[PDB]
Amino acid sequence: ALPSGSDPAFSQPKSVLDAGLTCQGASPSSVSKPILLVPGTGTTGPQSFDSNWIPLSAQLGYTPCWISPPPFMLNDTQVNTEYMVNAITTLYAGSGNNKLPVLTASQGGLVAQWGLTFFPSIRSKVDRLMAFAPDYKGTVLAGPLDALAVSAPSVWQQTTGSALTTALRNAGGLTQIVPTTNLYSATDEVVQPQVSNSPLDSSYLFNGKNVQAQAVCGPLFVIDHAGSLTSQFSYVVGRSALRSTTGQARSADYGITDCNPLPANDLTPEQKVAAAALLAPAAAAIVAGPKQNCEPDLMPYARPFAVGKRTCSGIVTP
């Protein structure tokens, strides 16, 4: 049984959360068919999606909207989730009180699932989740202690074994909460482990539509972390998920002829070039960003689910 009852309090002023939400060509308070895009570590919304799902979702008939939690998704993943929860509240009312899809890149999927686990109000407002390379179990490649012995808050949190990923799993968050499709790759160079095509993989959610590219395209098919978001294969799976009456991608809607690892066909030449360079700003943001030597404390609503772990203030207690 998941957390129920009232939503946790926000730590951020609402005005700050509002400033992080933008829609292309519309206000989030008056928008037709919004899709909420949640970016990856080290990026803003436009950096994650300008070269891919902002144009691609527009051509499918959605108004692209996004959050850009500062600085570049490097702060506390629990604060990044406040931006998403506030955005869902706003876009739900702003689209006529209609459920909306959420589409994510890397950490953005962890944020979405964290929000669905701990903020019950949004469960009735999210139609489906389409997550590209989500790291629900974190990654064994996060490397918070590689090179400098300090790393961004959200990098600690995305490290395998972290208090945050422990709390998500222990609270029941590795089972899908809304209809979810997870698209990922065994050759992801950022998120591992992803090789088993099974619940061991970081992108896997129980009862989700878990699509490891190599299970469809073969063991030597190669797409990396950025290509998991931008590829033509990824587009076909995401399109199926967004159109599906079940809320999940359908195996019938894609196949071996879609196994194209290059940027999605419908992107402009400029977008395809930008898609190849997707993570370049992320490295600069990380170098310039906040860094610390400990994992951020869990907020009170999550503390009971990671008792015994160690965060900045000490040992987690209930």
Rounded CA separation 38/110 (Å): 10
| Sign of the C-alpha dihedral computed for residues 170, 189, 83 and 157 taken in this order | positive
- Experimentally, the structure was elucidated by X-ray
Active site residues: 106, 188, 225
Fold observed for domain 1-318: Rossmann fold (3.40.50)
Contacts of 288 (CB under 8 A, 6+ apart): none
Which amino acid type is present at position 37?
L
For the record, the structure tokens of 264 come out as: 């999605």
Token pair, residue 108, equals 């953005």
Query: What is the Cα Rg of the chain in Å?
Result: 18
State the virtual CA torsion across 103, 193, 275, 82 in degrees, nearest 10: 40
Tokens of 87: 């955005």
Q: Measure the CA–CA gap between 230 and 278, rounded to whole angstroms.
A: 9
In angstroms, this model's resolution equals 1.6
- 3-state SS class at 23: strand
Q: Are 20 and 83 in contact (CB under 8 A)?
A: yes
At 269, phi and psi to the nearest 5? -55, -40
Identity of the amino acid at 125:
K
Domain boundaries, the chain: 1-318
